[PDB]
A paper describes a structure:
Mutations in the [name] aminoacyl‐tRNA synthetases (mtaaRSs) can cause profound clinical presentations, and have manifested as diseases with very selective tissue specificity. Among the recently reported pathogenic variants are point mutations in [name] gene, encoding the human [name] [name]. Patient symptoms range from spastic paraplegia to fatal infantile Alpers encephalopathy. How clinical manifestations of these mutations relate to the changes in three‐dimensional structures and kinetic characteristics remains unclear, although impaired aminoacylation has been proposed as possible etiology of diseases.
Here, we report four crystal structures of [name] mutants, and extensive MD simulations for wild‐type and nine mutants to reveal the structural changes on dynamic trajectories of [name]. Using steady‐state kinetic measurements of phenylalanine activation and tRNAPhe aminoacylation, we gained insight into the structural and kinetic effects of [name] disease‐related mutations in [name] gene.
Numbering used by the authors: 11 to 415
The structure:
Amino acid sequence: PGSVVELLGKSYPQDDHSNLTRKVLTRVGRNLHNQQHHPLWLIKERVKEHFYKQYVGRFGTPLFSVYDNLSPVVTTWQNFDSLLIPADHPSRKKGDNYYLNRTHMLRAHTSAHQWDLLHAGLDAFLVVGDVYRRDQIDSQHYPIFHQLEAVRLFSKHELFAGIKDGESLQLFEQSSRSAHKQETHTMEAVKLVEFDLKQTLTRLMAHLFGDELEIRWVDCYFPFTHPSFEMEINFHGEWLEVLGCGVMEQQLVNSAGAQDRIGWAFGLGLERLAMILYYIPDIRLFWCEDERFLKQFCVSNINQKVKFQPLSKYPAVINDISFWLPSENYAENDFYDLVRTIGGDLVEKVDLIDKFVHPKTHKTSHCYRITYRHMERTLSQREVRHIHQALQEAAVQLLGVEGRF
């Protein structure tokens, strides 16, 4: 912890919100999504190719400009306010974000760029980048992952171009908001935008996974879209959400300068997609540099089909860690950072298997079961003991927790 943070050549004074970790910092700028041949870059190029094809292939398809090198450091206004996220919304919890301070943060999603790009006059674009969130620790969650945003605007004439008396139809009106549309949108408009959205995503998935993937649309919520959806893909007997989307909140589109227009947007988890497309077991493999893994994504063209062969799964070592939280001063996702710092990518997952308050003291006890597993080799009991003991001492010094063990 400190007084000034220096990130990407810029300086940020620290305050009550500051909670960025040196570990996260060592990863900012990495840009896996722009790394030639990396599984993520691969998915990026394939999505890009699809959009390009569609532009040249169909007259109605617009040209999508692509931005994959925007700095992840944004203002809380870009990441939250511009997307209409309430001041008291849980997604703002310091516990789930990496804030430099009260006004700047590492983006939690690529949607943080929607407003500025809209304000710049663009009608169709894609933003691809690393995003950051403080989350639990397991093979499916990492503090850093990547997303690809897409925004598509429609003018009234463009939307109803294929309808006989379409110029008589409108985009806007003043009714009420319902489960199916916004208060200022016509059902006519929404039905067409929604259909375009789903057809676009469905075709993209078809291009990425082939005609023989099981997908389902699920209704959800986002403060920046409505109606909103999550597309899920059934993989290994299990419906997994791979993207979020919907019809852009008109207030957002209006404040950016495009009253005129109505649009849709979506944000899809490149990791999630990659893990499904190539089986990848574990999110941590995206960050290793074991050429048993990377060498498998060295294709002649992004069209050559990678036939990923999962590495061996080495034995894990499991150790529990208990302690006392301080006096009303502690967060779960905190200890999770001490863990990422000390155990790094050696930790496969952390589980809070138990927690209780002592009557006398008033002083809550936490017991975490940490699974230590190397993605590249067999960890010995010895080295794990050393990492586990360092985590133990660190907890006691830098989480005011008491050595209960």
